[PDB]
Amino acid sequence: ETKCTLKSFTVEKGIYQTSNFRVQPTESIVRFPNITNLCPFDEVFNATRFASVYAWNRKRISNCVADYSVLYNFAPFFAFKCYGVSPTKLNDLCFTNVYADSFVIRGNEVSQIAPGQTGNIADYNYKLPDDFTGCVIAWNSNKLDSKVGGNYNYQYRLFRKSNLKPFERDISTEIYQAGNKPCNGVAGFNCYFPLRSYGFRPTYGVGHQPYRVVVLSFELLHAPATVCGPKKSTNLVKNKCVNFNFNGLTGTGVLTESNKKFLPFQQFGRDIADTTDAVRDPQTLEILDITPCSFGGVSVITPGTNTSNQVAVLYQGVNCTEVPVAIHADQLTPTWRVYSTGSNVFQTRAGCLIGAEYVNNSYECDIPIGAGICASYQTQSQSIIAYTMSLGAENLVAYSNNSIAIPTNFTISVTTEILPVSMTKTSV
Amino acid sequence: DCTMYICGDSTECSNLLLQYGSFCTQLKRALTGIAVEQDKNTQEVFAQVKQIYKTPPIKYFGGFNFSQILPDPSKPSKRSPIEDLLFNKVTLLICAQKFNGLTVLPPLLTDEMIAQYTSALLAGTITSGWTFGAGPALQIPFPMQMAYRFNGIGVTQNVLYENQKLIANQFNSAIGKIQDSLSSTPSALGKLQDVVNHNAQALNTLVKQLSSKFGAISSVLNDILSRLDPPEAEVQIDRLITGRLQSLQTYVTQQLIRAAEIRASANLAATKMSECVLGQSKRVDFCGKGYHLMSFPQSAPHGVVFLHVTYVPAQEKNFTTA
Amino acid sequence: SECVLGQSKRVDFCGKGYHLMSFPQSAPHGVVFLHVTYVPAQEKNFTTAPAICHDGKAHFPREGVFVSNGTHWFVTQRNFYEPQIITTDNTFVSGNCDVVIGIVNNTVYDPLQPELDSFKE
Amino acid sequence: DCTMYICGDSTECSNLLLQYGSFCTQLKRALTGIAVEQDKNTQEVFAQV
Ligand SMILES: *[C@@H]1O[C@H](CO)[C@@H](O[C@@H]2O[C@H](CO)[C@@H](O)[C@H](O)[C@H]2NC(C)=O)[C@H](O)[C@H]1NC(C)=O
Ligand SMILES: *[C@@H]1O[C@H](CO)[C@@H](O[C@@H]2O[C@H](CO)[C@@H](O)[C@H](O)[C@H]2NC(C)=O)[C@H](O)[C@H]1NC(C)=O
Ligand SMILES: *[C@@H]1O[C@H](CO)[C@@H](O[C@@H]2O[C@H](CO)[C@@H](O)[C@H](O)[C@H]2NC(C)=O)[C@H](O)[C@H]1NC(C)=O
Ligand SMILES: *[C@@H]1O[C@H](CO)[C@@H](O[C@@H]2O[C@H](CO)[C@@H](O)[C@H](O)[C@H]2NC(C)=O)[C@H](O)[C@H]1NC(C)=O
Ligand SMILES: *[C@@H]1O[C@H](CO)[C@@H](O[C@@H]2O[C@H](CO)[C@@H](O)[C@H](O)[C@H]2NC(C)=O)[C@H](O)[C@H]1NC(C)=O
Ligand SMILES: *[C@@H]1O[C@H](CO)[C@@H](O[C@@H]2O[C@H](CO)[C@@H](O)[C@H](O)[C@H]2NC(C)=O)[C@H](O)[C@H]1NC(C)=O
Ligand SMILES: *[C@@H]1O[C@H](CO)[C@@H](O)[C@H](O)[C@H]1NC(C)=O
Ligand SMILES: *[C@@H]1O[C@H](CO)[C@@H](O)[C@H](O)[C@H]1NC(C)=O
Ligand SMILES: *[C@@H]1O[C@H](CO)[C@@H](O)[C@H](O)[C@H]1NC(C)=O
Ligand SMILES: *[C@@H]1O[C@H](CO)[C@@H](O)[C@H](O)[C@H]1NC(C)=O
Ligand SMILES: *[C@@H]1O[C@H](CO)[C@@H](O)[C@H](O)[C@H]1NC(C)=O
Ligand SMILES: *[C@@H]1O[C@H](CO)[C@@H](O)[C@H](O)[C@H]1NC(C)=O
């Protein structure tokens, strides 16, 4: 691994950093709320006569299973533009609540039901918010929304004072003041009737062919989930690194009971950096701390590959009563796990050291591990030994109030010193 | 760490990051270089003595009082009262948030291994003078060393021998006052606190910046991956990858500049320790204010403290000259 | 500028020990200094006293230090062993003989007195 | 200044910039540090008497 890291076939004496280790989770637990009954979306979808734009209906659905691949049979269409969610993934997500609605318009403005779309057909009739997330469906409804004599049940508004607020419906019918003449009379010049009606005939082609629009609009919030799909619940495990799913909140780690005084309305726990800390069980009323699985870094202390072939491993910043567990049956993030707990395991403030024997001795530091611990390759035939660094040779000076020491001979010596002065010039 | 920070242990995120190339290898190399440099910095300031010297059991220095600075064996750690005050004055949930890859490695030279160096330097500089800077240490009585030090600044040596008691009293009183001077004001140890605050604040702002959106759907990898299909999920997470890479690059650049700043102060401290401590300095206003006499080193969290002993004239009388 | 074109009094700047000389050499993208320095060696320890009292007047050394092998008293330089007889041009007088701690008795030889007493008679 | 440079006193530009996070806080901090340093520089060269 070190040879791969350095992109070379030869390495020199020193300590190198290679990669990280992480105890992968063993099993998974999935807990959902206990949803009862099925809400039929088919009868919700269709109406005997689709309401006009100036007065559109809406239904709010909750407390039922969320199956969404069944609607392909109860409504003909061509697009199924589910922008927010992948259609096949709806069987698992848990939602707060959902809205369903439908209304009939002309085909010239099918793309006008979208965030940021302006114009009289959307500004004064129906405009989406800029952060819409749903499954808009548009169908060319000529077989069921037209008559040879001209179907006249369809209505919209064209004149009004100012733009309407998002998802607001106005059903009043009052003569708009579109001139200097005071519009108090029933009708006349400069007094226009706000409600213009469509005229639909089979002679009309595309564009003017009437269309029907069906909208399912989700809304997601960190609130008690009431809608979720058909997924089976599972049981609970504790104190072991596992995958967990809670109400649609995927995660991985260890779960342990904690003395968190959550108030009844408070549900989640959070801390700095938007990291989830505690979760509330969808079935029982219990609060538990969540802690990420143990991880760390691995370093390789080796002498020169010229000299020998043995190495020693150092796991940084982990108590190595859990490293043998980290050496599991094809579970540890590093592929190699041969070392495991093959004796000569030493504990150090920096981390845990495998492959070297502690010696009650003191030399000069050669390969520095840290916290005053340094290793070397030597005999005791040849092995790796780790020891506490030695500052130097202890000395005692016979200080006294009437003593002096004077030299009687000298020595000339010559030393060397090297200093860089410049670097290679370049141009790009 | 490269991956564990940018990618929340995902699988497709790692493969998408491999496309960008070897950006994070330079980040992993620069931090290692900085760590090696900061381990080497403390090896020059302190490790300048050949051997660990020791003081004699009987402590009497011409009437001078060094009890405030010499190590006291009563404490578990051989640290002088001044060092004990300095350690308490500097103040070293926040660490639990560093589960995203951030780590702090321990220094190579532990604290008592530094206290032993400081004690050795004090013993050498109060027993043998400056002779142990160049060759083997040679014993010499302390008042004679003081006579040499006065002779070094143009004052004849009879001045000391006729005024031993007064100088001893002044030295003792000065040390006594300087012991309280640090504790009186709280802003004496400001640079060291600035160092620790800058490091902590940089780490905190990195961790907080981790949770931004950078114009994406959401700030959590798991939600976006389980929320959309891959062909749009990758488009959504590309912006997150770019933002986090930019944040890491900014962090490492700032750390490089700060390390370059610190190295100059380390070199200056090494020069002062070589010149002021192991000898007498003729440079003006270098080793304290006034004519320089002696110096004493002490250790503090991530730093060194010098006590400069200097000589200053006083009462003046004016005469006629030719 | 400092080590080569002169002598440096800074401690441990131009090499380890008392500085004598330097020589420069060139290397690819750098320079190499050869520092020639001075280091003491064999040590001998003696007894010392800060002052000498002859006639109630202290005698302090001019430049050096007092020393004694056990019987006589000599004055020698600090960095080398070279004893000399304590004459009147090695010492200077300052004060009386009661305000100093550690003073010891001895006789300071006066080169003028016997020379000008033998001739004048 | 953060906003006045990137955003020409607009309103939507400010809201779009808030989503990026706290990039310009460090820019406002570093320049202040430099200004304090350059004010302190002249206090050592001259103010020695
Ligand atoms: C490494 O883990 C072991 C096992 O938990 C620790 O040993 C126990 O540590 C707790 C507190 O950490 C003590 O209360 C127990 O008395 C310890 N038991 C034994 C048998 O030692 C050990 O302390 C951990 N390592 C470090 C450095 O804390
Ligand atoms: C000072 O030391 C030097 C060597 O360090 C001594 O020179 C040696 O003298 C002996 C006796 O003549 C020779 O055998 C050696 O070969 C000399 N060494 C060298 C390097 O030349 C010198 O004698 C010493 N000084 C005194 C006064 O003894
Ligand atoms: C020289 O020798 C020692 C050096 O420390 C000192 O003797 C001590 O003097 C103090 C106070 O004068 C006494 O309390 C100790 O009991 C002495 N130590 C002994 C007697 O072992 C002093 O500086 C000098 N001693 C004399 C006798 O002049
Ligand atoms: C050197 O200074 C120390 C510090 O003041 C002296 O120790 C003090 O002695 C007095 C009187 O016995 C006590 O009240 C203090 O509590 C002591 N302080 C400490 C820190 O122990 C010491 O006596 C002085 N040395 C001499 C020779 O006078
Ligand atoms: C201390 O130094 C004196 C210096 O005079 C030594 O005395 C001389 O010793 C030599 C050795 O035989 C004699 O030839 C001289 O005549 C002596 N000088 C005088 C004036 O009598 C003395 O021997 C030395 N003592 C020790 C222990 O080294
Ligand atoms: C030699 O030194 C001793 C003590 O260091 C001197 O002895 C004292 O000298 C004073 C003044 O002359 C007398 O009042 C004392 O009575 C002396 N005490 C003793 C025990 O002798 C002495 O004067 C010095 N000089 C000589 C020539 O001995
Ligand atoms: C669902 O089943 C659990 C399992 O015992 C039960 O406790 C709960 O009352 C049921 N109903 C709801 C709404 O959770
Ligand atoms: C239209 O809605 C009505 C309402 O009950 C329903 O009976 C009818 O089957 C629907 N027709 C469809 C979905 O084609
Ligand atoms: C390996 O070491 C031997 C002895 O130290 C040396 O002769 C040889 O050149 C080295 N090999 C390489 C490839 O450097
Ligand atoms: C080393 O020291 C430890 C504890 O101090 C002791 O248990 C062990 O026997 C010693 N071994 C040797 C070879 O000194
Ligand atoms: C000393 O200075 C003062 C003014 O500071 C002056 O009055 C006095 O005459 C001076 N001394 C002599 C001896 O001139
Ligand atoms: C010189 O020092 C030694 C111990 O290092 C001591 O035994 C000896 O007595 C000293 N010399 C003299 C003349 O006292």
Numbering used by the authors:
A (entry chain C): 298 to 677, 689 to 736
B (entry chain B): 737 to 828, 849 to 1078
C (entry chain C): 1030 to 1150
D (entry chain A): 737 to 785
Article passage:
All the S-trimers contain Gly-Ser-Ala-Ser (GSAS) and 6P mutations along with the T4 fibritin trimerization domain for increased stability. Of note, one RBD in BA.2.13 was clearly disordered, representing a stochastic movement, which, together with BA.2 and BA.2.12.1, suggests structural heterogeneity in the S-trimers of BA.2 sublineages. Of note, S-trimers from the BA.2 sublineage harbour relatively less compact architectures in the region formed by the three copies of S2. By contrast, BA.1, BA.3 and BA.4/BA.5 spike possess relatively tight inter-subunit organization with more buried areas between S2 subunits. Additionally, the BA.2 subvariants displayed slightly higher binding affinities for hACE2 than the other Omicron variants. The results reveal that the lack of G496S in BA.2 sublineages meant that the hydrogen bond with hACE2 K353 was regained, increasing their binding capability, in line with experimental observations revealed by deep mutational scanning (DMS) assay. However, we found that BA.2 subvariants BA.2.13 and BA.2.12.1 showed increased immune-evasion capability over BA.2—with BA.2.12.1 exhibiting greater evasion than BA.2.13—and BA.4/BA.5 exhibiting even greater evasion. Since group E2, D1 and B antibodies are sensitive to mutation at residues 452 and 486, it is highly probable that BA.2.12.1, BA.2.13 and BA.4/BA.5 can specifically target those antibodies, rationalizing the large decrease in NT50 of plasma from individuals who have recovered from BA.1 infection against those variants. However, group D1 antibodies showed reduced efficacy against L452 substitutions, with L452M (BA.2.13) causing mild escape, L452Q causing moderate escape (BA.2.12.1) and L452R (BA.4/BA.5) causing severe escape. Of note, BA.2.12.1 and BA.4/BA.5 display increased evasion of neutralizing antibodies compared with BA.2 against plasma from triple-vaccinated individuals or from individuals who developed a BA.1 infection after vaccination.
Owing to multiple mutations to the spike protein, including in the receptor-binding domain (RBD) and N-terminal domain, Omicron BA.1 infection can result in substantial NAb evasion. The Omicron variants that have emerged more recently contain similar RBD sequences to BA.2, with the addition of L452 and F486 substitutions—L452Q in BA.2.12.1, L452M in BA.2.13 and L452R/F486V in BA.4 and BA.5—and exhibit a transmission advantage over BA. We expressed and purified the prefusion-stabilized trimeric ectodomains of BA.1, BA.2, BA.3, BA.2.12.1, BA.2.13 and BA.4/BA.5 spike (S-trimer).
